[PDB]
């Protein structure tokens, strides 16, 4: 790859600079190069990978939603559809890149619970992003692949992590969004979000000194979705 000649530590360092400069495509490129060195990623490095690609794909999803809304409202020339398809193809390409890195390099049987849950959560998310723009026999394959990855992550997180762990919380938040927005299962979504919030609250003393601000943020977002969904 384009990053193959750079030392791993330099790639990490440049990803941090790219984050500071809000150059998220660069920072995704640096982190992909780091992943391709074939060594595990620490928690801090998983965060860099996550932030970079989420920023990239987030901007594409936002663009796709604008174009799709313009498109549907003109279904009430080919240019809107062509440009929406262009952005769509690029978004799919980024999700394919992430899902390929997860399968080729990051997801494995070894490693701590955080890493295993985090990468499986990632896999569920990027299948969910593919599902947001999918239609045909592609779309069934995609939705099940998302649910499957989320379910593996949930099983591990319930067995290995406290119910306030921010990866476990963020996973459950994102699975409940899958249920509501992707799987047309509002009751599964309210159920999962309610269980997750209540169980975190029931074992609030398990909050960690180094991540409680993240935990309490996700529980507030669970509550916001519950409010929106009821």
């Amino acid at each position: 790859g384009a990053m193959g000649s750079m030392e791993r530590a330099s790639l990490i360092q440049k990803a941090k600079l790219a984050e500071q400069a809000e150059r998220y495509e660069d920072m995704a490129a640096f982190m992909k190069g780091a992943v391709e060195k074939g060594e595990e990623l620490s928690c801090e490095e998983r965060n860099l990978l996550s932030v970079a690609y989420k920023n990239v794909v987030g901007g594409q999803r936002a663009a796709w939603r604008v174009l799709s809304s313009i498109e549907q409202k003109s279904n009430e020339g080919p240019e809107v559809r062509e440009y929406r398809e262009k952005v769509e193809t690029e978004l799919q390409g980024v999700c394919d890149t992430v899902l390929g890195l997860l399968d080729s390099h990051l997801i494995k049987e070894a490693g701590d619970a955080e890493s295993r849950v985090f990468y499986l959560k990632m896999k569920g998310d990027y299948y969910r992003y593919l599902a947001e723009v999918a239609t045909g026999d592609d779309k069934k394959r995609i939705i099940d692949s998302a649910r499957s990855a989320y379910q593996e992550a949930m099983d591990i997180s319930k067995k290995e992590m406290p119910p306030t762990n921010p990866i476990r919380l963020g996973l459950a938040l994102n699975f409940s969004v899958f249920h509501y927005e992707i799987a047309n299962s509002p009751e599964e979504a309210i159920s999962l979000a309610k269980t997750t919030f209540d169980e975190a609250m029931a074992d609030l003393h398990t909050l960690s000194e180094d991540s409680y601000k993240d935990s309490t943020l996700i529980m507030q977002l669970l509550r916001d979705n519950l409010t929106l969904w009821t």
């Binding site: 965060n47 996550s50 932030v51 989420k54 920023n55 987030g58 998310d125 963020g170 938040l173 994102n174 409940s176 969004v177 509501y180 927005e181 979504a189 993240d214 943020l217 996700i218 977002l221 916001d224 979705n225 929106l228 969904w229």
Partner: peptide, 10 residues
């Protein structure tokens, strides 16, 4: 309104 998913942080 759209459901909220896990945000970017740190």
């Amino acid at each position: 309104q759209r459901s909220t998913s896990t945000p970017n942080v740190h």
